[model samples]
Every structure is written in C-alpha cells, then in structure tokens.
Target chain A: KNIVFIGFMGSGKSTLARALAKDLDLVFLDSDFLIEQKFNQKVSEIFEQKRENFFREQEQKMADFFSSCEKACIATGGGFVNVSNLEKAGFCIYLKADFEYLKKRLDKDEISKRPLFYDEIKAKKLYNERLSKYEQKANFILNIENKNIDELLSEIKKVIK
Target chain B: SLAKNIVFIGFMGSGKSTLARALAKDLDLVFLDSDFLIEQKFNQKVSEIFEQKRENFFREQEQKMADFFSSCEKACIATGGGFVNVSNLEKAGFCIYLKADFEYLKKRLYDEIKAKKLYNERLSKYEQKANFILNIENKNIDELLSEIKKVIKE
Candidate 1:
C-alpha cells in the first residue's frame, strides 16, 4: 500500500510527492514519469499521437503498477484516479488548489505546454466536471490556497496516521 | 540568492530523484538527476557503471560530479545512491537524508530488481554518513515535501 496524490494538473502532485518522500522517507514514483517511461515518450507527445483514449489505457496500466508497490508515495496524473480501480491500493490525498491559484501558476504558458488549459473557460468547465470525481474518491481533501508546502504536508501527515 | 538548491542524500530508491524533481519544479529551479548525468557522461546506465568499474572508481566519479554541481546556483541535485560517500558533501548545500527502515528498503529493492545492488550499497553508506535521517515510515509525499520546504525556506 502507498500514499497516492490526486489532483488537477497544476495542483502540485509532483511537488508534494517529493516533499512527502523526504518527510516520510518513502520511495516516490510520479505516475506521469512511469507512463512516459513505459511509452518511451513524453506524456504530451503520447496524448498528441495516440489521443486521450490511448493515454487513459496507459494510465490504467500505470495505476496498477503504482498500486502494487509495497512502500511508495505515488504522485498520480490529474486524470489517473478517475478510473474506477485506481484508488483500491492507497490513501488518496487530493491537493485541492482553487482556480485562482491554478490560474496564477499556469499564467500564459497554455499555448505550448498545457494543451488541457488551452481555453480558460473550458478549463474551468473541466475543473467543475472533475471536482466531484476527486471529492468522491479522495480519502482526504487538502485546500491549498495560500498554504505553503510545509503546511500542506503537515496536515496530510496528521490525517494519514 | 535565497539558496534554492536542494541536495538530497539517502539510500537508493529512497525517492531522492523523485522528490528532488518535484521540489525543484515547485520552487522553479532546474532539476538535475545526478545519476542521469553520470549515465550521460559515461555513456552508460548506472547498472552498467557498477558492473564496469571498481567501487573506488565510482566514488571518485561521484565526488567529481558533486563538485561540478556545487557551482550551480538554482538547481535541485539528486545525487546518485552513493553520493554521500563524496567527502565534505555537507558543505555543498542543504543536505536532506531521505530515509526509510531497512525493511522498506528491502521491499523496494525487491520491487525494482534493477536497483537492488545499488540500494544495498546506499544502505551501507548511509549507516556511516546520514546527517538528518527522516523516518518516513508512515508519512505520505505531500507531508514529507511540505515539511522539508518549511525547513529549507521558512
């Protein structure tokens, strides 16, 4: 069993995964990197070449691989946990950052990097759509607005144990 | 010059690279996986490096790598499994020892068969040089990262 981080794209899953690994002294695996390694390509390239359906299938495989780990902190991709079986092996901590926070982090780089955030309105709609899925599945919800990395981790540690 | 460099030291498979990358990105610093550098420089993988060279040669190479990275300003350096063996590493930057119990190490090695020997080497070396041993037996990634961020920046 491992501690899995689930949240939106800019919600800091990778960031939190690193800190949590250090604090807890556990192995950390970013689901994105695992998927990238499996495909031998960047995730954006995978999504572009194979489309979302193929990427989702890859996500499922990555989820299974990470869930099987004995001791790890798995930082999952934003959409990975939406798959039904993904949450069975670990405690899900949603790094809940609001839209404003996300917007600030993602400022104007959407054209090239974040294809998902290509349109602000569409991104908001997607966030609204996925909010329920994350809320329903998460074992713990951490609201990350204005809170620094230390505060978020401390709260999570308290909740998990 | 707020000292953004995060130097991670610990047993192999202890999530140094993973955590370092995450922390580096969060802090907006460049992330450097030292093992990746070694692999690049030697034109071989870490597993192959271990197979090819004596342990002493690997240590000297690692020390050289550490020294090279010391000149970098805004970067997170995820040292190789045996990076701490390099002399005077504490002077390089903020040294964080990402630790787990030996049982956890054994389990991780069992899972990642490619890294088993390297992990064992890291465990033995850690027994001698770990400065801040984080007992991450029960904590999650978010908790660990947040704690360290607080320590280093706040």
Candidate 2:
C-alpha cells in the first residue's frame, strides 16, 4: 500500500507526503532528493554534466525501485507524473494549486536550484503539458485553497485505507 | 522572461480594479480582470459560483483563469484577493500589491467580518508575493497611478 503525491513543483507534494507517512506509519520516500543523493549530484548538475536523457533514465531507475517497496509514502518530482507505469506504485494523489500560486511560493533561489526551473517561460509551457499527465494518473486531487494541512489530511484520509 | 502584464493584488476595497484600469490605460496594455473572466467562463457571478459550485470549484475556476491570462502579453491584470496566492502570477508578470491599512479597508468594504477575516489571512501573503508594494494608505488615485507608472518605466 503505497501513497504517492504528484503535482507541479511548489504544490506541497513533499510536505504533505512527509506528514502523511508518519501518521499512516509508512516509510516516507522523497524521490528527487533520494535520486540526487544516489548520484551525489544535484538535479541541476545532472542536467548540465550529462545529457538530460541520462537524468531521466536515472529517474526511471528510482521509479522501479519504488515499485518493489511495500507500504511506502512517496513524494514525486514534478515530471515523474509522465511515467504512466509508475502510477501502480501507490494511490496517486494530486496536490492542485494554480501556477501563479506555485510561482509565488517559490522564490528565485528556489527555482534556480532545480533544472526544470532554469527558464520560467519554458517551465510554464512544460507545466501545462505535464498537468494533463498528472490528471491522467491522479486518483485523488487535494485542492490547496481555502483549506489547511489538517483539513487536507482529513480529505486524503477519506480516500485511502 | 516576465510578460509585460501588470497584475494588481490586494484585500477588498484596496482598489485593485480601479488602479488596474488606470495603469492599463496609461501603459497602453490590454486590461483583464480575473473575476470577470471567471463569471464569463462559468456563466455565473463569483458569489453564485461560491454558493452553487462551492469554494473549491470557484478556486479551480480562478486558477484556470489565471493560467489562461498568464499566457497573454502586454496586458494589465486585476486579480481577486485569492489570486495573489496563484504563484503563476509571479511568472506571468510584475505583481503590485495595493497596501492600505485595515481601517481604510473596513470603511470602504461592506462585509466587515468576512473582509476582516480574509484581510488577516491574506495580508502577509500579499506582501510576500508581490513584486512591488504600492502604499495607498492615504494617497490619491493620481499618486498611485504615477507611482506605478514610475515603476513600470524602470
């Protein structure tokens, strides 16, 4: 029984998953952070030092690892939602927030830290395209508007066992 | 690159709509109000959307409106209170938060309780989110327009 959080960057996917993992008594996994740790390189460096294809392949490597885990609460990097096969890893939960809000929450330093955020104009175009993929796999959409974490946790509780 | 759009954000009665219209005219940018777009899209006023579709639906519609407008260029945008939190606004263009004290907002707005509650909830966020904070606490509309124009030109 895996719980997967998916959505655009700055949508609190990691934050929600961190809390849920503990409460649900499941192992929490931050996929992007773990990937960076695995290679001993930041995601930005992976894109610059190697072909982006290599970085994506590394992502696939991690996805397959999670496929073998049991009762895990997983936080996904924004783009991983595109891998349709990965949806089987958990109950895919979508954290929905407007792009404007996502941009607001993320500052310049925050954006510059990740590869996908290198050029906002392109990132936004990618954001729209990936959103449809997120929708493709999302079983539960937690709208982060006029609601708090406790409220959303309750909403998530209503969905999964 | 940020769009040439000037987005306005503030609590109720801080005059986001009026200021946005004036700025758009002065800057020769197309003017768009997110609330009006939401009303048009759903064929319902914002109040009706809240009553019928519920707050979350109104928010989802609001996000769609923001996402749509973020793509347009050389425009002035007037946003509702919640739009400041839309994160996409920062990437879309420069955001101006109309800063007025709670007293001024209370006198200007009709719903005291709800307005106060929302103001308290979103005040810090508006300041944190906006690219520029335009103090309209005691300034006239002309002064506000001049200040905004000064920033836009720089």
Candidate 3:
C-alpha cells in the first residue's frame, strides 16, 4: 500500500512525505508538484489563470494517480482529502497543526506563494471547515504542533503497519 | 592524526556561537560561525540575506558553510539553528548539541511563538547530529566550558 499524507496548508505534508519516502526507499509523488509539472505552471498560477474548477480537476487526476500507484509516498493538496477514493490510494495520514501555529510557521514569502491563504479570515475558516474531513479521511492523524522532523518520522514509522 | 574539530549544533536561541567561540579561545583553535561566514561572503547581514534570498537560498549557503567546516581542521564551529538538518552534518567532527527548554529559548529569541515552533523543529535534529548533548538549562558558560573541555579531551 502507498503512504499518503493529507493536511492543511503549511502543515508540512510535502516536506514530511518527501523525507519519509527517501527514508523508506519508496517513490515520492506530490499532487501539486505533479500537477505543476504536467501543466508547466505553478499551483497558484494555475488556480489564478485556469480557475479553481480546473485546479480541482487536476487534483482529482493526481488522487487517481496515487490510487493507481503501489508502494509510493504521496503528499496531496490541502483539499485532496475532499476527493473521492482517497482511502483507495492507501494509508492516509493527516498532519494536523493549529491555525495559529500554521500562521506562525508561514512567513511573508510563504504566504505570498499560497493562493488559498491570501485572506486570513477566509483561510482560517477554510482550515476550520476542513479539520474534521482531514481527520475522518485519514488512517492516522498526527498532531504536528511542536514536533520536529525526527519525531515525526519516528512516530510515522511506528504506525505504518 | 589531525586535530578533531568541535562543532556546536542547536536551536536558534541556544548559545552555540557564544560557547563555540569561547571554547576556541580557551583551546587556541580557530573559531567559525556558519551564519557569519555566509554573511561575509554575501556582504549582507543574515536577516538581510534571508529577506532578499529566501530560506532555500539561505539553506543552500548553510550547506556550503557546513561542507567547508566539515573539512576544516583544529576549529570550533558555531552553526545556525537549522545546521543540524544539513546532510553532511555528521561529518563535521565532534558535534555538541547545546539544548535548552522552549521557555528558555523563547526568552532568548526575539519572536517567542516562532522561536518555540522552530525550536521544536530543530531540537531532535540537534540531538541526532550531535556526538555530545549539553543541557544548558541553568549552567553558566564557565561550567559548560569545563564540561565541554572535559568531554572533548577524553
């Protein structure tokens, strides 16, 4: 089964997933990055230029791609948990961090890079709304409040049956 | 045999630079700060560089500094907080992790919340990369130095 990471923005899904994949010697697939590669455009650029509907379609394709892959480590978009057949993609782990904590972690440059995070109130609302979906959609939910990479890796290792 | 380098690894607010510099002075070895080296090369302060170049570029510079110091001899190196995350960090001679509590680091740093977050992120990295772990919760520099001296000489 593939290892999939789902989380809110700035929860470190991509970073941890890449690290995990490297450590476990598994193929690494990032939904946003793959979409960017396919479209030859950044995720934010794609969303702004082609609209949310097009971006969501691409995210679904990536979700499907993850479901089809075997023994891979997948880091999905923040909204990827909302996609159907997420469980079929394999072990889904949610990286949960508090909204305040996420705000602290994301710097100005990082904030600029994220399209969905432009408006603080809207982003917070989005975070609140998606919190349960992320938890319910995952095989594991990791509280990433103050844990380091090593701790995260070790914790993930213990639960990966 | 070449003299072993002693590298200080820790979170941002930990006294890595201060201790490493003092140790180098006491031992009559060269002292280097990874952040300082990068600043000198770029002719800009670390903060300025961070503002201009972004974290990825700054981290790339840190990697270069780590690689250089790993090969340097008879030196005591003080590294940036994230230095422990460097891939070649284990090769940087004897690493001493100067660990402190988040409360202590929060006081030492400018941004309390962000510092605590970063401290959490780098603490385990410092532990994993270090040959020796030094808990500097209540210890003064003299006591820490004595302990470091005692450990490195042995």
Give the TM-score (vs. native) of candidate 2.
0.48
- Can you tell me the CAPRI class of model 2? incorrect
For residue B3, what is the lDDT in candidate 1? 32
Structural similarity of chain A in candidate 3, as TM-score: 0.93
As for TM-score, the candidate ahead, 1 or 3, is 1
Name model 1 segments beyond 4 Å from true. Answer: A106-117, B1-154
Please report the candidate that would top lDDT against the real structure: 3
Q: Indicate whether candidate 1 or candidate 2 has the larger DockQ.
A: 1
> lDDT of each prediction vs. the true structure?
0.69, 0.72, 0.75
Sorted on lDDT, best first, the list reads: 3, 2, 1
Over B22-116, each residue of candidate 2 has an lDDT whose tens digit, in order, gives: 76656544456778655533446788989998978777766755654555456577888888666566766788999988888777766677667
> Considering every candidate listed, which one attains the maximal DockQ?
1
lDDT of 2 at B66: 63
Instruction: For candidate 2, state the interface root-mean-square deviation in angstroms to 1 decimal.
Output: 21.0
Task: List residue ranges in candidate 3 displaced over 4 A.
Answer: A107-117, B1-154
What is the DockQ of the complex in model 3? 0.01
Query: Judged by lDDT relative to the true structure, which candidate is superior, 1 or 2?
Result: 2
